[PDB]
């Protein structure tokens, strides 16, 4: 697939978590919501996002 650059958001769909992905080397109009379990190991990126939420 393509490469996750940054996590920009989180939501639940039917109770399951999804993240809004900014793809490396793609513009923002290419951002997509992906199941958390299908995002691969970018746990550092997920951690960054969650920290930013918790911050405010």
From Swiss-Prot:
It comes from the Eukaryota. It is found in: Nucleus; Chromosome. Female specific, expressed in both somatic and germline cells but highly enriched in ovaries. In the germarium of the developing oocyte expressed in germline stem cells, cystoblasts and developing germline cysts. Expressed in nurse cells in the germarium and egg chamber. Transmembrane segments: none annotated. Changing residue 26 to A: Abolishes binding to H3K9me3 peptide. Disruption phenotype: Females are sterile and produce eggs with various polarity defects. Residues 2-52 form the Chromo domain. Wild-type eggs possess two dorsal respiratory appendages. Mutations in rhi/Rhino results in partial or complete fusion of these appendages resulting in a single appendage from which Rhino gets its name. Involved in piRNA (piwi-interacting RNA)-mediated transposon repression. May be involved in formation of the perinuclear nuage, a subcellular structure implicated in RNA processing that may be involved in transposon RNA surveillance and silencing. Required for ping-pong amplification during piRNA biogenesis, probably by promoting transcription of piRNA precursors. As part of the Rhino-Deadlock-Cutoff (RDC) Complex associates with, and drives non-canonical transcription of germline specific dual-strand piRNA clusters 80F, 38C and 42AB, but not single-stranded piRNA cluster 20A. The Chromo domain mediates binding to chromatin through interaction with the histone H3 N-terminal tail. Binding requires di- or tri- methylation of histone H3 'Lys-10' (H3K9me2/3). Homodimer in solution. Dimerization is essential for chromatin binding. Component of the Rhino-Deadlock-Cutoff (RDC) complex, composed of rhi/rhino, del/deadlock and cuff/cutoff. Interacts (via C-terminus) with del/deadlock (via N-terminus); this interaction is direct. Two copies of del/deadlock associate with each rhi/rhino dimer. Interacts with cuff/cutoff; this interaction is indirect and is mediated by del/deadlock. Interacts (via Chromo domain) with kipf/kipferl (via C2H2 type zinc finger 4). This is Chromo domain-containing protein rhino. It comes from Drosophila melanogaster (Fruit fly). The gene is rhi. The chain holds residues 23 to 78 of 418 of the full protein.
């Amino acid at each position: 697939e393509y490469v996750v650059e940054k996590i920009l958001g989180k939501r639940f769909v039917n109770g399951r978590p999804q993240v809004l992905v900014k793809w490396s080397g793609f513009p923002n109009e290419n951002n997509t919501w992906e199941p958390l379990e299908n995002v691969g190991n970018c746990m550092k990126l997920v951690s960054d996002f969650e920290s930013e939420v918790f911050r405010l």
